[PDB]
A paper describes a structure:
[name] consisted of two domains with a large cleft between the domains and substrates bound to positively charged and aromatic residues in the cleft through hydrogen bond and stacking interactions. Here we show tertiary structures of [name] with six different conformations as determined by X-ray crystallography.
Interestingly, [name] showed three conformations [[name] (open form), [name] (full open form), and [name] (closed form)] even in the substrate-free state. The crystal structures of [name] (full open form) and [name] (closed form) were obtained only under crystallization conditions in the presence of sodium PG. Two molecules were included in the asymmetric unit of the crystals of [name] (closed form) and [name]/ΔtriGalUA. Root mean square deviations (RMSDs) between two monomers in the same crystals were calculated, respectively, indicating that there were few structural differences [[name] (closed form), 0.543 Å; [name]/ΔtriGalUA, 0.106 Å]. Compared to the C terminal domain of [name] (full open form), those of [name] (open form) and [name] (closed form) were closed by 18.9° and 34.2°, respectively, suggesting that the domain of [name] was flexibly opened and closed even in the substrate-free state. There are a few examples of proteins whose domains are closed in the substrate-free state, as observed in [name] (closed form). There is little structural difference between the closed forms in the substrate-free state and the substrate-bound state. Further studies are necessary to elucidate the physiological significance of SBPs adopting the closed conformation in the absence of the substrate.
Numbering used by the authors: 2 to 610
Amino acid sequence: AFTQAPMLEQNKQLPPVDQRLPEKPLVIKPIASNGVYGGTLRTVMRGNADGNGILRTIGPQGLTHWTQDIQTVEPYVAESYTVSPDAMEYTFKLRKGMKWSDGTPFTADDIVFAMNDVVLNKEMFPQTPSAYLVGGKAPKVSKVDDYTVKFEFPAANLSFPETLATPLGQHPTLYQKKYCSQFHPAYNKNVQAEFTKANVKDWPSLMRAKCSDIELPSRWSSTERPSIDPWLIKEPYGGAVTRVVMERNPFYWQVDPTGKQLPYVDRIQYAVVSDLQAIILAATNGQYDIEARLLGSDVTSRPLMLKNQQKGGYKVFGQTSANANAAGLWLNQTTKNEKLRKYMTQHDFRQALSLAMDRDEINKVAWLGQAAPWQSGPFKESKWYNEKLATQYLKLDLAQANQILDRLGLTKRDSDGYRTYPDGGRVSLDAIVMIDRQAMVQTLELIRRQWQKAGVELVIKGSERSLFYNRATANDYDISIDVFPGGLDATLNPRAYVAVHPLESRMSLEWAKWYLSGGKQGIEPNESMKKRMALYDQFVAAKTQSQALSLFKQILQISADEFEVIGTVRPAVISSLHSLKLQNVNEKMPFGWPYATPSLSLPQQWYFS
């Protein structure tokens, strides 16, 4: 019954299609219609550090997968799975006969190797990635037979199936044991010979170079790394390539309802382009069949995109960002500026800084009026909605800001009109920002002038993305501006409400380091933050959905009371485009990294009309 692409008819070494598919392949229901084979999907990456663009184009192929409405997940690579009544035990059934891109078997051996020999190997990952932890506690992972793998957590872990559908939860399917064991000392007695044959000097760097990790550029730099991906790297990503080309995986493990082995589209070609203006011009000319990653957050792109739809042969669809805030102020409560810290740690000082802001002016100038004032909370339709976390201190009230700052003792003025500390110099805050995010830079420039009227100085420190993260983890900043997640994905990314992300919980990464190390590194958080961390552990280890619900709402209320991070606007709509000839794009899908959009729309069932 099963049929294949005409392009694979010419490969005479390939087995017949029913032997390359699993016995029971996953049947993909198309978004709008049954498709036809053929064509090259044209799309775009910006620069040499945009490998996630490939991931978000072809899609993470994890054990589970989001529904189109992102409310729940379904078995994906797993045929099915069970969960014990206590929710500590997850048993995954794999698809018998499934194969890697090189024709060799996909079995529990691969999942057990990826878990035990890579993810949970402490030489490879000194800090075990959090996706596979419950409150810091690791699972025991074992093979029950060739097509059954068991995960045993020391505590209840209701979120694990949702984790397995995010990009960061795809390790279990990322490593073929046979190829990857060559580069692992527990398997290759002569792993030293491979170190020389590469530019490395230890087995963890060897693994990263040859087998890679979720977000490493090495994931897309070679054709020989096996995968279960719908398309395989053919012309690879590299430090200075002008293009990337990917070709259908002849051993892909999915069919459409009529029995066609997917994908429909034969090839994907990514143009690798440096300056954003060339991407805008190429997109508005209709040279890309899909662009749902790069322009949509740039609000000045939208009028251009809409105007050229007919000219360029494309349709713009607007996506709903999952982030609660498009450009939020993370205030560092462990700032190294001692004089500043005595005010940073005071609730009412943070309240003043929010009251001295004009979110209508920010929306007008930097977001072309397409956003709306908001702080850090989930949106109204979320069951997590908290009004205070969303809407406190949104209206400009400069007279109240100035009264508060006076009450705090910041009444002495310097020769330039700024407030000073009672003992010290000018009230001045350093804010780090990625210079490429022009809207965020412009937001800070507007905040600087707004806060100038309260006698507060904002110093803007733009930088490359690399130095921006080095300053953060070095604890060398007072404010860092970036998105607040949580509008739609609060329990997937609670980092704005509790300091649990080591790179992004920038109310203090030192507090985050304390959480992640069980108190042995970092700086001890304040009582309200420790309280939220203990409740967070209870939340992730909750035994029922109703216990989880109460515990996470407690965390959100304490976050609202503390008011540690200051939102500017919730995001404007995210403007994406697809070629009019490209069928089966879910134009209603939300936008977000936890869903790896646009690949949430199942690009293996896109086709050309």
